Amino acid sequence: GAMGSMERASLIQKAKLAEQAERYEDMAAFMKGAVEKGEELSCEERNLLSVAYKNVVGGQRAAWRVLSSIEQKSNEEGSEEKGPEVREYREKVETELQGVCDTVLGLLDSHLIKEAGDAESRVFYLKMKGDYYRYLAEVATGDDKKRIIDSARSAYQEAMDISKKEMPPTNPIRLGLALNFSVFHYEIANSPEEAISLAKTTFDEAMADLHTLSEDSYKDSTLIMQLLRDNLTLWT
């Protein structure tokens, strides 16, 4: 790997610089190099990893959606034939997206998840696993689509089971996991009622536990709770 010669600490330092410079591809490459050193990641380091790849794939997803919409319009009655170029370029973007998702999944499988024993680390990685299978599912149209969707579901479910046993209802990781799994239900699994029920119960259970928190923890939890509320408002 091209980062093999760079110190772990220098990779982390450079990932933080890359973030400041909004150079998210570089940030992701640095954090991939840091993961591949083989040591477990701290909380801060897990956050750098997640932010880098979230931003890289987020941009790919937005571009894929623009291209897929143009491609759909091209297949409507009365649309002039323009050749294979729209499909080819959507395929190009799609293949690069799938590559990034496979790279993240590969870091999680080799060997972040298996070394993560604390609930906060293990839930965080399993959530990432669900998220990157969800991004694969968004673009899947073949023989494996069902298996891809099930992979996402299984990862999210294991994370949920741990989170409910080991974390308080206000814990930001528990909250973020639930937010995303609720979106999975709505957008991927064709289960809007499940999505709504999960978002509502998560919100309500968190609300009831806010009284136990410091001001700073309250801020963290309520920020994510508002995203649950935002989704519920969109869906109801």
């Binding site: 973020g176 937010l179 995303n180 709505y186 995203l227 935002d230 989704n231 969109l234 869906w235």
Partner: peptide
């Protein structure tokens, strides 16, 4: 699109 984190 709905919110995710």
């Amino acid at each position: 699109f709905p919110a995710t984190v």
